[PDB]
Design an enzyme around this catalytic site. Structure first.
Site, PDB file in Angstrom:
ATOM      1  N   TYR A   1      50.000  68.962 -16.659  1.00 40.41           N
ATOM      2  CA  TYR A   1      49.593  67.599 -16.625  1.00 40.41           C
ATOM      3  C   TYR A   1      48.899  67.412 -17.959  1.00 40.41           C
ATOM      4  O   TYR A   1      49.424  66.509 -18.856  1.00 40.41           O
ATOM      5  CB  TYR A   1      48.883  67.233 -15.397  1.00 40.41           C
ATOM      6  CG  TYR A   1      48.191  65.694 -15.730  1.00 40.41           C
ATOM      7  CD1 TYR A   1      49.210  64.559 -15.370  1.00 40.41           C
ATOM      8  CD2 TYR A   1      46.908  65.390 -16.040  1.00 40.41           C
ATOM      9  CE1 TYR A   1      48.580  63.292 -15.629  1.00 40.41           C
ATOM     10  CE2 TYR A   1      46.318  64.264 -16.138  1.00 40.41           C
ATOM     11  CZ  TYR A   1      47.226  63.241 -16.093  1.00 40.41           C
ATOM     12  OH  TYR A   1      46.863  61.742 -15.949  1.00 40.41           O
TER      13      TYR A   1
ATOM     14  N   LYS B   1      50.397  65.021 -21.536  1.00 40.30           N
ATOM     15  CA  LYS B   1      49.510  64.254 -22.092  1.00 40.30           C
ATOM     16  C   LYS B   1      49.356  64.490 -23.648  1.00 40.30           C
ATOM     17  O   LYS B   1      49.639  63.679 -24.504  1.00 40.30           O
ATOM     18  CB  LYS B   1      48.237  63.720 -21.597  1.00 40.30           C
ATOM     19  CG  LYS B   1      48.469  63.307 -20.081  1.00 40.30           C
ATOM     20  CD  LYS B   1      49.066  61.748 -20.437  1.00 40.30           C
ATOM     21  CE  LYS B   1      49.020  61.169 -18.918  1.00 40.30           C
ATOM     22  NZ  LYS B   1      49.869  59.913 -18.902  1.00 40.30           N
TER      23      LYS B   1
ATOM     24  N   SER C   1      44.379  61.428 -21.090  1.00 36.30           N
ATOM     25  CA  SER C   1      43.558  61.879 -20.043  1.00 36.30           C
ATOM     26  C   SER C   1      42.474  63.010 -20.690  1.00 36.30           C
ATOM     27  O   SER C   1      42.825  63.436 -21.679  1.00 36.30           O
ATOM     28  CB  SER C   1      44.260  62.480 -19.060  1.00 36.30           C
ATOM     29  OG  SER C   1      43.449  63.059 -18.161  1.00 36.30           O
TER      30      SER C   1
HETATM   31  N1  LIG Z   1      43.924  57.913 -12.352  1.00 33.96           N
HETATM   32  C1  LIG Z   1      43.017  58.628 -13.140  1.00 33.96           C
HETATM   33  O1  LIG Z   1      41.934  59.043 -12.686  1.00 33.96           O
HETATM   34  C2  LIG Z   1      43.801  58.899 -14.669  1.00 33.96           C
HETATM   35  C3  LIG Z   1      42.797  59.371 -15.538  1.00 33.96           C
HETATM   36  C4  LIG Z   1      43.495  59.588 -16.773  1.00 33.96           C
HETATM   37  C5  LIG Z   1      44.611  59.122 -17.244  1.00 33.96           C
HETATM   38  N2  LIG Z   1      45.559  58.433 -16.149  1.00 33.96           N
HETATM   39  C6  LIG Z   1      46.939  58.029 -16.543  1.00 33.96           C
HETATM   40  O2  LIG Z   1      46.980  56.460 -16.321  1.00 33.96           O
HETATM   41  C7  LIG Z   1      48.365  56.080 -16.126  1.00 33.96           C
HETATM   42  C8  LIG Z   1      48.164  55.380 -14.822  1.00 33.96           C
HETATM   43  O3  LIG Z   1      47.492  56.040 -13.731  1.00 33.96           O
HETATM   44  P1  LIG Z   1      47.235  55.371 -12.367  1.00 33.96           P
HETATM   45  O4  LIG Z   1      45.968  56.092 -11.680  1.00 33.96           O
HETATM   46  O5  LIG Z   1      47.478  53.957 -12.413  1.00 33.96           O
HETATM   47  O6  LIG Z   1      48.298  55.648 -11.438  1.00 33.96           O
HETATM   48  P2  LIG Z   1      49.675  55.122 -10.682  1.00 33.96           P
HETATM   49  O7  LIG Z   1      50.631  56.213 -10.220  1.00 33.96           O
HETATM   50  O8  LIG Z   1      48.997  54.068  -9.728  1.00 33.96           O
HETATM   51  O9  LIG Z   1      50.450  54.152 -11.786  1.00 33.96           O
HETATM   52  C9  LIG Z   1      51.638  54.984 -12.468  1.00 33.96           C
HETATM   53  C10 LIG Z   1      52.702  53.903 -12.295  1.00 33.96           C
HETATM   54  O10 LIG Z   1      53.838  54.455 -13.072  1.00 33.96           O
HETATM   55  C11 LIG Z   1      55.030  54.130 -12.209  1.00 33.96           C
HETATM   56  N3  LIG Z   1      55.789  55.146 -13.119  1.00 33.96           N
HETATM   57  C12 LIG Z   1      55.846  56.513 -12.864  1.00 33.96           C
HETATM   58  N4  LIG Z   1      56.983  57.207 -13.570  1.00 33.96           N
HETATM   59  C13 LIG Z   1      57.654  56.092 -14.064  1.00 33.96           C
HETATM   60  C14 LIG Z   1      58.889  55.959 -14.683  1.00 33.96           C
HETATM   61  N5  LIG Z   1      59.683  57.202 -15.003  1.00 33.96           N
HETATM   62  N6  LIG Z   1      59.344  54.700 -14.921  1.00 33.96           N
HETATM   63  C15 LIG Z   1      59.019  53.640 -14.541  1.00 33.96           C
HETATM   64  N7  LIG Z   1      57.768  53.693 -13.894  1.00 33.96           N
HETATM   65  C16 LIG Z   1      57.296  54.955 -13.505  1.00 33.96           C
HETATM   66  C17 LIG Z   1      54.626  54.279 -11.019  1.00 33.96           C
HETATM   67  O11 LIG Z   1      55.405  53.751 -10.009  1.00 33.96           O
HETATM   68  C18 LIG Z   1      53.291  53.782 -10.820  1.00 33.96           C
HETATM   69  O12 LIG Z   1      53.229  52.508 -10.367  1.00 33.96           O
HETATM   70  C19 LIG Z   1      49.068  57.445 -15.918  1.00 33.96           C
HETATM   71  O13 LIG Z   1      49.482  57.545 -17.448  1.00 33.96           O
HETATM   72  C20 LIG Z   1      47.954  58.591 -15.543  1.00 33.96           C
HETATM   73  O14 LIG Z   1      48.537  59.626 -16.110  1.00 33.96           O
HETATM   74  C21 LIG Z   1      44.825  58.248 -14.880  1.00 33.96           C
END
Ligand SMILES: NC(=O)c1ccc[n+]([C@@H]2O[C@H](COP(=O)([O-])OP(=O)(O)OC[C@H]3O[C@@H](n4cnc5c(N)ncnc54)[C@H](O)[C@@H]3O)[C@@H](O)[C@H]2O)c1
Ligand SMILES: NC(=O)c1ccc[n+]([C@@H]2O[C@H](COP(=O)([O-])OP(=O)(O)OC[C@H]3O[C@@H](n4cnc5c(N)ncnc54)[C@H](O)[C@@H]3O)[C@@H](O)[C@H]2O)c1
Ligand SMILES: O=c1ccn([C@@H]2O[C@H](COP(=O)(O)OP(=O)(O)O)[C@@H](O)[C@H]2O)c(=O)[nH]1
Ligand SMILES: O=c1ccn([C@@H]2O[C@H](COP(=O)(O)OP(=O)(O)O)[C@@H](O)[C@H]2O)c(=O)[nH]1
Lengths: 367, 366
Positions: B171, B175, B144
């Site tokens: 957070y 990362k 991120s």
């Molecule tokens: N949404 C944004 O703007 C953004 C920006 C930068 C980075 N990210 C990263 O992208 C990734 C996905 O983000 P997102 O927006 O789709 O979020 P999200 O919460 O929809 O997706 C994360 C998924 O991971 C699962 N999860 C969490 N911990 C887990 C574990 N210990 N074991 C198994 N499954 C687990 C959750 O159930 C969820 O389905 C994450 O790593 C997040 O940090 C997101």
């Protein structure tokens, strides 16, 4: 000011010296939690109730004022959440935690990162979680000069806030632990102090505890081990890792600080966090560099060992050991000013003498 | 290029869009591992064999090329060793891992650090250990823009992949440590890894069937659209902080469409798969994924108003701790090395896809 202290990794080299200082210089109650992974699975040297008794027994002479002081010993891994919880419950309430457990061979961390990230980072995570669960708000953490690394690509005493550029996974694991502890201060009010020890060395004046050379990865214990082999009946040369460093003589420069001085710093650190109140908050997280501020190259250390032991100590120049910064010397003004830390050992000669006294009387370590 | 891919966190918002792209634009086998902690414990939206057969049944007209493509779903926590090991064994050999699981509410990480260090750091640790154990040497990690934080003291310009890392929240720290762990594994075990720094993920697939529902969301756009929904399907839209060192005082972000992020992962998978013994210096790589355009909170709300036609009344509040003032991406390396070509540029088109999904889902997937 009595306080119940939980010392993780308390059966180790630095831990044993800290525990002894707690037992002889304070009124705190001591609980040690160690897996014995760094002590060959043995704890004969730990000052438990029985061990202390046997010592006072087998020997005759004026009974010391600390003869009845001992620590409790819980054998297990701090990552075993169940075990850890049981320790906090049975020995609770725990007032402060002194987190000293870890794997610390810089060279090995480069070759096997996951072993270090697991033990070093998950270990501190579990303790912080346990502290939260059991309402413990004070922690003293064993950090290292390894978090600094080499200057961003004059070599002088490193300040507490110098840039952090870890040269090894070991250094990275210590650095992330500091970030985690810091964030817990703001979030949960946990008061933490990170003590960056530089190169721990020496042994208690009693000559009964220290770092045995067999299985050691550290310079001085290895040098003294070579002497222990020169003493024995006929390659036993002392290995110098890298001679092409950006230093005066080409070998790594380090700051060798006596473990008894490190021990007194922890006692001062404990008193500091215990006196913190709700108005202090900005003071809930603090860091201190612990060293003598004087540096010795690998060559110079070997020369001091030669003069201390009276032996030749034949050397042999080798290539660099991956993960080693060229220079690591500490500026300890903050520790001296804020904690009132006053190191008793300044020269490596005096320190080396205590290391040799312990080693030369322990051909087989504690065994 | 038939590669078996294990997608951790694949049932999530970005994961669902990445999986769909894998299923429709590639010939890779897909295995999803997700605890469903971020999906309300449900997986009706996951394109499993059964769910996909239902879409086909309800659909009228000729089958698309991807009509029968589906992914396997393993429900469990990646921190559960027995579970993770069983997944690698039964679905093995796993060729590549795409690690997307984590907790990602920047504001919450500041208030509860241990929850984030545990899940985010221990999660990637277990995956790296499993990869070593099961002989998997390729990983794509969801990083991120939060790892950058604010600049050290000017000219606010898009952020370069190697800009200084000064995390403003736990957070971001979680990362960043993951990137250093992955990097060290390259050097030590030959693991080939790519860390993709997504900036502000937004939008929804053109089909309008998957996206980030507003209920329980901590992100800006889903919350704005939720304010429009609540009024139809205070109640005022809160602006967190108006005293930031930015042109209008509110945080500036780079909103990148989830479908463009998805295509970047496919390109990343191809990049690591082509790496060989001579490419040691390329075993560890990082890329910033954004549009290079920035929009302040005020400007985003302004776009939502036009897109929806709703007044969207607002109320200015104090800063949400953990937020950097500006986060916009320079994606030169992604474009130059991966050949990434984002289809969405301006927020208007992106917002349109977000609104299309939300307005038709008053109750989310429920
Ligand atoms: N949404 C944004 O703007 C953004 C920006 C930068 C980075 N990210 C990263 O992208 C990734 C996905 O983000 P997102 O927006 O789709 O979020 P999200 O919460 O929809 O997706 C994360 C998924 O991971 C699962 N999860 C969490 N911990 C887990 C574990 N210990 N074991 C198994 N499954 C687990 C959750 O159930 C969820 O389905 C994450 O790593 C997040 O940090 C997101
Ligand atoms: N020795 C140095 O020069 C030096 C320098 C800077 C920092 N440090 C740090 O000081 C601390 C103590 O170092 P030391 O020289 O006494 O080493 P040591 O190995 O003698 O002490 C560590 C103790 O921790 C225990 N331990 C390790 N993992 C454990 C776990 N998971 N659960 C329970 N116990 C565990 C070991 O059994 C050992 O007794 C470490 O954190 C080390 O990283 C040491
Ligand atoms: O047999 C040895 C062991 C260590 N060293 C060097 O001595 C310095 C201190 O190493 P040590 O492992 O004792 O502590 P560290 O500085 O890594 O914390 C470093 O430059 C090591 O490379 C050496 O030259 N030969
Ligand atoms: O109800 C809200 C939710 C978010 N934001 C702001 O919108 C920007 C983006 O926040 P988001 O949580 O959507 O993603 P982030 O930038 O933290 O990764 C930040 O400045 C937030 O403080 C806001 O003003 N009101």
């Amino acid at each position: 000011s009595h306080m119940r202290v939980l010392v993780c990794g308390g059966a180790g080299y630095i831990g044993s010296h800290f525990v002894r200082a707690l037992l002889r210089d304070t009124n705190h109650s001591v609980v040690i939690v160690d897996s014995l992974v760094g002590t060959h699975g043995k704890s004969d040297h730990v000052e438990t109730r029985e061990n202390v008794a046997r010592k006072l027994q087998q020997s005759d002479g004026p009974k010391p004022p600390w003869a009845d002081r001992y620590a409790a010993l819980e054998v297990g891994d701090v990552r075993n959440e169940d075990f850890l919880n049981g320790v906090f419950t049975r020995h609770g309430p725990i007032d402060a935690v002194v987190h000293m457990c870890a794997f610390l061979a810089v060279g090995e961390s480069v070759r096997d990162p996951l072993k270090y990230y697991d033990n070093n980072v998950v270990g501190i995570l579990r303790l912080l979680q346990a502290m939260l669960l059991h309402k413990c708000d004070k922690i003293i953490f064993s950090s290292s000069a390894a978090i600094f690394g080499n200057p961003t690509m004059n070599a002088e005493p490193i300040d507490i806030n110098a840039k952090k550029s870890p040269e090894s996974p070991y250094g990275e694991s210590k650095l992330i632990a500091e970030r985690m502890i810091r964030d817990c201060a703001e979030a949960y009010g946990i008061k933490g102090i990170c003590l960056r020890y530089f190169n721990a060395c020496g042994a208690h004046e009693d000559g009964d505890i220290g770092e045995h050379y067999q299985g050691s990865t550290h310079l001085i214990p290895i040098i003294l081990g070579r002497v222990m082999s020169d003493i024995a009946p006929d390659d036993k040369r002392m290995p110098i890792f890298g001679t092409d460093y950006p230093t005066p003589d080409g070998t790594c420069v380090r700051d060798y600080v006596h473990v008894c001085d490190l021990a007194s710093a922890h006692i001062l650190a404990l008193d500091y966090v215990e006196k913190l109140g709700p108005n202090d908050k900005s003071k809930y997280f603090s860091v201190f560099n612990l060293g003598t501020s004087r540096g010795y190259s690998v060559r110079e250390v070997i020369e001091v060992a030669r003069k201390t032991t009276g032996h030749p100590i034949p050397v042999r120049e080798c290539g660099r050991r991956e993960g080693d910064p060229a220079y690591l010397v500490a500026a300890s003004d903050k520790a001296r000013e804020v904690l009132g830390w006053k190191p008793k050992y300044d020269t490596l000669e005096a320190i080396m003498e205590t290391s040799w006294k312990f080693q030369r009387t322990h051909p087989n370590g504690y065994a």
